[PDB]
Structures are given as C-alpha cells and as structure tokens.
Design a protein around this motif. Structure first.
Motif, PDB file in Angstrom:
ATOM      1  N   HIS A   1       0.812  -1.221   0.000  1.00  0.00           N
ATOM      2  CA  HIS A   1       0.000   0.000   0.000  1.00  0.00           C
ATOM      3  C   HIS A   1       0.851   1.280   0.000  1.00  0.00           C
ATOM      4  O   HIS A   1       0.374   2.352   0.315  1.00  0.00           O
ATOM      5  N   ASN A   2       2.100   1.142  -0.424  1.00  0.00           N
ATOM      6  CA  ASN A   2       3.047   2.245  -0.532  1.00  0.00           C
ATOM      7  C   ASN A   2       3.217   3.023   0.766  1.00  0.00           C
ATOM      8  O   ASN A   2       3.267   4.209   0.731  1.00  0.00           O
ATOM      9  N   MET A   3       3.304   2.319   1.889  1.00  0.00           N
ATOM     10  CA  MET A   3       3.408   2.925   3.210  1.00  0.00           C
ATOM     11  C   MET A   3       4.835   2.908   3.761  1.00  0.00           C
ATOM     12  O   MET A   3       5.011   3.217   4.910  1.00  0.00           O
ATOM     13  N   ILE A   4       5.840   2.526   2.978  1.00  0.00           N
ATOM     14  CA  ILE A   4       7.221   2.438   3.514  1.00  0.00           C
ATOM     15  C   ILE A   4       8.194   3.487   2.969  1.00  0.00           C
ATOM     16  O   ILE A   4       9.379   3.412   3.250  1.00  0.00           O
ATOM     17  N   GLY A   5       7.703   4.495   2.273  1.00  0.00           N
ATOM     18  CA  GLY A   5       8.578   5.559   1.776  1.00  0.00           C
ATOM     19  C   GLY A   5       9.033   5.348   0.348  1.00  0.00           C
ATOM     20  O   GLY A   5       9.016   4.251  -0.137  1.00  0.00           O
ATOM     21  N   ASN A   6       9.443   6.430  -0.296  1.00  0.00           N
ATOM     22  CA  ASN A   6       9.881   6.445  -1.686  1.00  0.00           C
ATOM     23  C   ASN A   6      11.270   7.073  -1.977  1.00  0.00           C
ATOM     24  O   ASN A   6      11.690   7.091  -3.118  1.00  0.00           O
ATOM     25  N   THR A   7      11.967   7.575  -0.963  1.00  0.00           N
ATOM     26  CA  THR A   7      13.300   8.116  -1.096  1.00  0.00           C
ATOM     27  C   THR A   7      14.125   7.536   0.023  1.00  0.00           C
ATOM     28  O   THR A   7      13.564   7.083   1.012  1.00  0.00           O
ATOM     29  N   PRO A   8      15.458   7.539  -0.123  1.00  0.00           N
ATOM     30  CA  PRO A   8      16.255   6.978   0.975  1.00  0.00           C
ATOM     31  C   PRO A   8      16.028   7.666   2.278  1.00  0.00           C
ATOM     32  O   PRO A   8      15.997   7.043   3.314  1.00  0.00           O
TER      33      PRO A   8
ATOM     34  N   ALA B   1      14.214   5.729   5.424  1.00  0.00           N
ATOM     35  CA  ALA B   1      14.943   5.675   6.687  1.00  0.00           C
ATOM     36  C   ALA B   1      14.122   6.221   7.831  1.00  0.00           C
ATOM     37  O   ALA B   1      14.064   5.641   8.886  1.00  0.00           O
ATOM     38  N   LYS B   2      13.491   7.352   7.609  1.00  0.00           N
ATOM     39  CA  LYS B   2      12.712   7.994   8.628  1.00  0.00           C
ATOM     40  C   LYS B   2      11.663   6.992   9.155  1.00  0.00           C
ATOM     41  O   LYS B   2      11.514   6.827  10.391  1.00  0.00           O
ATOM     42  N   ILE B   3      10.982   6.295   8.225  1.00  0.00           N
ATOM     43  CA  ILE B   3       9.962   5.262   8.544  1.00  0.00           C
ATOM     44  C   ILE B   3      10.550   4.104   9.382  1.00  0.00           C
ATOM     45  O   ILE B   3       9.985   3.731  10.417  1.00  0.00           O
ATOM     46  N   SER B   4      11.687   3.592   8.960  1.00  0.00           N
ATOM     47  CA  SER B   4      12.414   2.555   9.698  1.00  0.00           C
ATOM     48  C   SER B   4      12.812   3.036  11.070  1.00  0.00           C
ATOM     49  O   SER B   4      12.816   2.235  11.958  1.00  0.00           O
TER      50      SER B   4
ATOM     51  N   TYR C   1      -1.812  11.248  11.841  1.00  0.00           N
ATOM     52  CA  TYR C   1      -1.057  10.005  11.788  1.00  0.00           C
ATOM     53  C   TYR C   1       0.444  10.287  11.905  1.00  0.00           C
ATOM     54  O   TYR C   1       0.915  11.376  11.622  1.00  0.00           O
ATOM     55  N   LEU C   2       1.207   9.263  12.231  1.00  0.00           N
ATOM     56  CA  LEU C   2       2.637   9.407  12.483  1.00  0.00           C
ATOM     57  C   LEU C   2       3.447   9.831  11.260  1.00  0.00           C
ATOM     58  O   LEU C   2       4.472  10.510  11.406  1.00  0.00           O
ATOM     59  N   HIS C   3       3.012   9.416  10.063  1.00  0.00           N
ATOM     60  CA  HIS C   3       3.691   9.745   8.804  1.00  0.00           C
ATOM     61  C   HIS C   3       2.680   9.924   7.705  1.00  0.00           C
ATOM     62  O   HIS C   3       1.777   9.098   7.532  1.00  0.00           O
TER      63      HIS C   3
ATOM     64  N   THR D   1      -1.090   4.274   8.439  1.00  0.00           N
ATOM     65  CA  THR D   1      -0.052   3.335   7.917  1.00  0.00           C
ATOM     66  C   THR D   1       0.186   2.335   8.990  1.00  0.00           C
ATOM     67  O   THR D   1      -0.443   2.377   9.998  1.00  0.00           O
ATOM     68  N   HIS D   2       1.093   1.409   8.762  1.00  0.00           N
ATOM     69  CA  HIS D   2       1.384   0.372   9.744  1.00  0.00           C
ATOM     70  C   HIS D   2       1.987   0.927  10.983  1.00  0.00           C
ATOM     71  O   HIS D   2       1.821   0.350  12.036  1.00  0.00           O
ATOM     72  N   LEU D   3       2.717   2.049  10.868  1.00  0.00           N
ATOM     73  CA  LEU D   3       3.243   2.703  12.051  1.00  0.00           C
ATOM     74  C   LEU D   3       2.104   3.021  13.019  1.00  0.00           C
ATOM     75  O   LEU D   3       2.223   2.853  14.243  1.00  0.00           O
ATOM     76  N   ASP D   4       0.998   3.527  12.477  1.00  0.00           N
ATOM     77  CA  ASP D   4      -0.144   3.867  13.346  1.00  0.00           C
ATOM     78  C   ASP D   4      -0.774   2.758  14.124  1.00  0.00           C
ATOM     79  O   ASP D   4      -1.160   2.948  15.293  1.00  0.00           O
ATOM     80  N   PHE D   5      -0.892   1.579  13.499  1.00  0.00           N
ATOM     81  CA  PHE D   5      -1.286   0.378  14.230  1.00  0.00           C
ATOM     82  C   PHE D   5      -0.287  -0.160  15.195  1.00  0.00           C
ATOM     83  O   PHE D   5      -0.672  -0.668  16.288  1.00  0.00           O
ATOM     84  N   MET D   6       0.987  -0.061  14.852  1.00  0.00           N
ATOM     85  CA  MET D   6       2.008  -0.352  15.844  1.00  0.00           C
ATOM     86  C   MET D   6       1.820   0.522  17.085  1.00  0.00           C
ATOM     87  O   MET D   6       1.809   0.029  18.204  1.00  0.00           O
ATOM     88  N   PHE D   7       1.679   1.823  16.849  1.00  0.00           N
ATOM     89  CA  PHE D   7       1.615   2.845  17.885  1.00  0.00           C
ATOM     90  C   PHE D   7       0.353   2.728  18.745  1.00  0.00           C
ATOM     91  O   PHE D   7       0.371   2.796  19.982  1.00  0.00           O
TER      92      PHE D   7
END
Ligand SMILES: N[C@@H](CCC(=O)N[C@@H](CS)C(=O)NCC(=O)O)C(=O)O
Ligand SMILES: N[C@@H](CCC(=O)N[C@@H](CS)C(=O)NCC(=O)O)C(=O)O
Ligand SMILES: [Zn+2]
Ligand SMILES: [Zn+2]
Lengths: 217, 217
Positions: free
Chosen positions: A79-86, A90-93, A142-144, A149-155
C-alpha cells in the motif's frame, strides 16, 4: 486460497499486523496456536516451508515470511506505506524501531515476578518517553503522511497496552488519547474490534505477570 | 562536512554500521561516548536535533536518524542493498529481524550476574539456531544476492560475538566459518580491522558480565 498468518492466540507481536490487514481489507486466515498448543507449533515449525522458522509467520502460496516487522512492512509496502526516497524510507524505519522499543518496554518487565517493583522505575521513565511520542505526533492525524499506515497500528497497540498498565500516564497527553480514539473509529478497525475474531486478551504471552492470563485481573 | 555516527565506545549495536560504512567508503566522523561519559550524553541528548533521541545517532547536515537498523538501512539504501521489489525488500527485512534476534540472544543474558547459569540453556538452544542460519546461507557467499550487504555485517558481528562466548558452537558449521573468513578478507574490512580506530572490545556495554569490561579477561 488466502494467505495465512500464524501466531499464538494473543495480541503481542501480531496484533498490529491484524489491525493493518483489517484496515487495508486484505483477506487472510489465522492459524492460531492456543495456550495448550505448544506441541502443535513444534510439529509445524520445521514443516511449513519457512526459511527462518518463527512466530508469527505468514504464507501466501509459494511466498512465506517470518519476523513481525517484515510481515507488517510487506503488507505496508503493497500500500506504498514504507517511503519512496532513501531519506523517507529511513525515517519510517526509525519510527518503526522506536515503536518496537515502545512496545518492548512493557514486555521486558512483564514476565518476571518482580513486575510490581520494576513497574515503579518504568513509570518514572514513561512520561518522557510518552512526551517524545506526543511531540513527534504533534498536530497530525497520523505518524507519517496523512492516512493511516502500519506505524499507526504499531503505535495504537503500544499505547493501548500501556494505558492498561497505567491509564493516567497516557491520559496526560490529549493528542495521544485523540489518536487512540481516531484509530478505534476507523470503520474497518471498529468492525474488526467488535467481531468474533478480535483477541482482546492477553496483551502478552499467557505466562506474563502483567498482560497475561486468560482474562484481565 | 562529514556525517557523524554517535555511540558508546563499544561494539554493540553500532559495530555493523561501522563495518558497513568502512566497507563502502561513505566517509564519516564518529562522536564517541566513553565509559564515563553518561553525563555528556544526557546533556547532548535533547540538543542534537533528534526527533526520537537515542544512541546510536547519525547526523548528516539537516538530516538525522536514530535506531541502529534505520541508520544501517539508510546507508545500505544509498548503496542499493535493501532490495528492489516488494518480495525482495520483505525478505531482506526478514533476514534483518532474524539477525537482530541472533545478536540479542547474547545481550538478553550478558548483563545478568547470573550469566554463567543462563549460559547453559542458551548453549543448548544455540546449536539449533546456528543450524537454521547455516542452511539459510547454504553454499552462497553472502546472505542475500551475490555481494556483501549490511546483512552480512550484522551476521558477521553476531557470529563473532557468539564465537567469543563459545567458539566451537560456530566452528561446528564450516560454511559459517568460511563466511567469517570471507568477510574478514574483504580488503576494505581488513584494513579497517587493522586500523587504530577499530574497536575490538567490549562486545556489549561495559557493565556486562559476558563481553563487558575495558579489556578481555
Ligand atoms: N523478532 C521476532 C521475535 C519472534 C519471537 O520471539 N516469537 C516468539 C513469541 S513472540 C515465538 O514463539 N517464537 C517461536 C519459536 O521460538 O519457535 C519477531 O518480531 O517476530
Ligand atoms: N532499538 C534501538 C535501541 C537503542 C538503545 O537502546 N540504545 C541505548 C544503548 S544500547 C542507549 O544508550 N540509549 C540512549 C538513551 O537511552 O538515552 C536501536 O536499535 O538503536
Ligand atoms: Zn491492497
Ligand atoms: Zn557510496
């Protein structure tokens, strides 16, 4: 037919994966392993085609994964929730890593007897940890980016586990509370949470002095 | 001009970063915190521009990160090591997760007084874990693809730490020993390991009972 998510019949590491699946609406089957199913897992472990056998696992035909964050990032990536630039990736990770820590803080003290002793320093520390998270969230929904995104469910899961441990700690930051409600209001999340499927308890492994047991204390 | 990696002056969570940085030549300065710099750190902590303050950190101009895996992946991403399809990305994240687990198995017992008792069941389980890794790697030189990645330095560091704890655990797997020798022979890594800046010790934080202290026993 449909992909399988195998985990213990507990919240724990898999709940953010379930929440994500449910929110994006992807079909899945759970293979649960209940409190007395230790040996069933032992039998399946080396037998599922998995390259790094563990729980949770995830199988979709030929394709299989272990590691909860990898599973979550796999669905997220679709769902394109992990970023598109290095930089963004990274920020997402980094966010994920901090969320992993946020959750694991609870897990680190929940399995020993002295949990009520350990709880004391834990709560001394918690408000700065939470403050960090509330400043990072800031005024965003949301966090990003601007959708869940998955970060939000984690959180969400982490927060919910932690609110349980001490309801007022989280309650002191309006934006975290409004976040908790924001996620619970998401229609697929609400439906899920109101369903037969949903696992309210335990928060941790059954053998936990906190978050454990068949039901809340 | 140069980016900054900041960490305790130990191997720990930063070693694979340092190894990756030295392998690719991404030029960098290292802000080192020594055994007695607790107060130093406490004071920089909130005035380095970090969104989620923590050790390790990585500052490169306006850009900063925390989370060891996030920093690792940032560098790796810049050098095309985190995969190019959702499947490949997801496998790489799976391998990461397994490798963090492998390093953490040491850390989870090394800090406890009771380390020599906890050692015994650790060593009973260990052979089964190493078998998993040995078969996953198989005949390949590297864990994923045909050139060294961040995974291979995470893996190298975990195995070096484990060999130290129990040499013949790892020597029972020739492919794992050959892997260690393969990483050690990479010219950039070799020159690095032979440099003054290299950190051979401690493995874990100084206050640890296994791989702790200012030098080996
Ligand atoms: N880092 C791993 C940890 C997984 C893990 O430790 N799983 C436990 C329960 S949460 C388990 O039962 N593993 C199965 C086994 O040991 O065989 C992840 O995120 O999945
Ligand atoms: N999950 C984080 C863990 C970071 C962490 O726990 N760092 C410790 C040392 S290993 C630390 O000193 N943190 C700085 C602090 O707590 O202020 C990572 O991978 O970087
Ligand atoms: Zn979809
Ligand atoms: Zn480069």
């Amino acid at each position: 037919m449909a992909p399988v998510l195998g985990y213990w019949k507990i919240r724990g590491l898999a709940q953010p994966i379930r929440l994500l699946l449910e929110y994006v609406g992807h079909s899945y089957e759970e293979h649960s392993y209940g409190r007395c199913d230790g040996e069933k897992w032992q039998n399946d472990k080396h037998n599922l085609g998995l390259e790094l056998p563990n729980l949770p696992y995830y199988k979709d035909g030929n394709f299989s994964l272990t590691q909860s964050l990898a599973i979550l990032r796999y669905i997220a990536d679709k769902h394109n929730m992990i970023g598109n630039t290095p930089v963004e990736r990274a920020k997402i990770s980094m966010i994920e890593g901090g969320l992993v820590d946020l959750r694991a803080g609870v897990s680190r003290i929940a399995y020993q007897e002295t949990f009520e002793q350990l709880k004391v320093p834990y709560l001394q520390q918690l408000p700065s940890t939470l403050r960090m998270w509330s400043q990072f969230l800031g005024n965003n929904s949301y966090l990003h980016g601007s959708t869940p995104t998955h970060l939000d469910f984690m959180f969400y899961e982490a927060l919910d586990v932690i609110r349980y441990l001490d309801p007022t700690s989280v309650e002191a930051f309006p934006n975290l509370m409004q976040f908790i409600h924001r996620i619970e209001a998401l229609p697929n999340i609400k439906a899920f949470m109101e369903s037969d499927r949903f696992i309210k308890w335990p928060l941790n492994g059954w053998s936990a002095y906190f978050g454990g047991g068949d039901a809340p204390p």
